[PDB]
Amino acid sequence: SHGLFKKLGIPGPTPLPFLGNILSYHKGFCMFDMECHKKYGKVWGFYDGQQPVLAITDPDMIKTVLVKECYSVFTNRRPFGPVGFMKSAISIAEDEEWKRLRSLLSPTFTSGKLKEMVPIIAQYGDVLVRNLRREAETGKPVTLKDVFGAYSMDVITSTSFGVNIDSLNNPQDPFVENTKKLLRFFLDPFFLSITVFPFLIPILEVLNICVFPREVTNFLRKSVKRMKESRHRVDFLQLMIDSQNSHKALSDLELVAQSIIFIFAGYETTSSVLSFIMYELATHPDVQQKLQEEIDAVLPNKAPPTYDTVLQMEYLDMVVNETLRLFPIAMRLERVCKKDVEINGMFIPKGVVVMIPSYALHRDPKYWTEPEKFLPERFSKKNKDNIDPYIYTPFGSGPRNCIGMRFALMNMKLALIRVLQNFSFKPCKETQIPLKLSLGGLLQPEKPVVLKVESR
Ligand code: HEM
């Protein structure tokens, strides 16, 4: 099927047999999407092994795929590798089964239900401050990945199951051990193989091989059973078991798999984005000072932030949004075409993966002035409405966007406020001023960001 885009009159790199264009992934997903956009223009296609992938960049065409024709045509993402019982997760559920899961879990992420999570989240904001002050009063350079990763674990554990632990200073607890335990290696030899060898995916399903290590899942599967046995609470687990008794209902095996991806998504993202924010704040002290001035103005005398005060901080929203533009951790948005459909004057055949290159759009000079720079002023209210909502898609769009968007934004902002209320961050020895992105399948820096923490 290597002649598809040739017959459709769609440009793209010439694919090799059995490999497609995966050899061009040697500079990471980010660099490959940039070069193809510059060479082939608005629309191009390539191959991940035998799988044809059509990249679209027209905002009207993006809206049709992600919003207008989401339920009818572009409903599911590309099939993942061996998942086992995790096939019931909402992030990989398909068609009607996903629609049931999305509706059953939508009330869990309401703005009203998010308010009640602020007191628990803010509880570990001060825990993070104490962990930073112990490393700041000693003048030790701080790897943000460890402290922010510790903070994100504390928020996820308490918000999901109510478990209250200082993961940074309790790495030996049985709960933190399994949750941290995970293979963190999309361009790893495994995921590169299943691209060339998608036929081997059902092989590993019957072998009971899962991308999730079976030790962690069995611990989490058994742990949730004990918590349900114990069953006021306002955490994710209660909010889902409450929906069980409340359109069909959620099974206790679905409930476990549903909550696992919340930890999956909540843990790695939050910490990674927070480190990306702090690198920019360290390399741009003027933004950090202006953000610190705003944080102190809304919250005098280092006042504890609440749900309402965070949403008032406009520059904090600008700082978060601009960092997400420079570093869209998804790097891509994908939908599988379910049928022969003509959209925006173009024929997309069945089974093709339609891809939206979020990274290549976020740095396209056509839509962003000096895209390679860090300019929070792009998202000021004066310049805010000139941004097309289908070019800047940090959390996706349409019915299948990031369901935990508001929680994640609240969690990171509550973290930034408490940290910036008490500390200022400056570059250190190994700051790596030209921050290099990892050439792998994950949007992370080549080397972990290390900075100096000074007590105000
Ligand atoms: C920095 C934080 C985060 C970012 C930048 C982010 C971004 C994204 C993106 C780009 C998608 C794909 C949407 C698309 O295909 O159109 C997504 C999906 C998703 N995210 Fe997040 N996300 C974040 C945090 C979280 C958290 C903390 C949770 C936990 C509840 C979460 C849960 C999900 C789920 C469940 C999906 C799948 C949606 C579906 O298939 O129905 N995300 N996220």
Ligand SMILES: COc1ccc(-c2cnnn2-c2ccc(-c3csc(C)n3)cc2)cc1
């Ligand atoms: C490990 O680095 C990441 C973790 C989570 C996310 C993330 C953000 N928003 N969603 N999300 C996500 C991604 C994949 C799954 C997944 C893979 S396999 C399975 C059953 N679920 C679930 C959630 C992004 C990067």
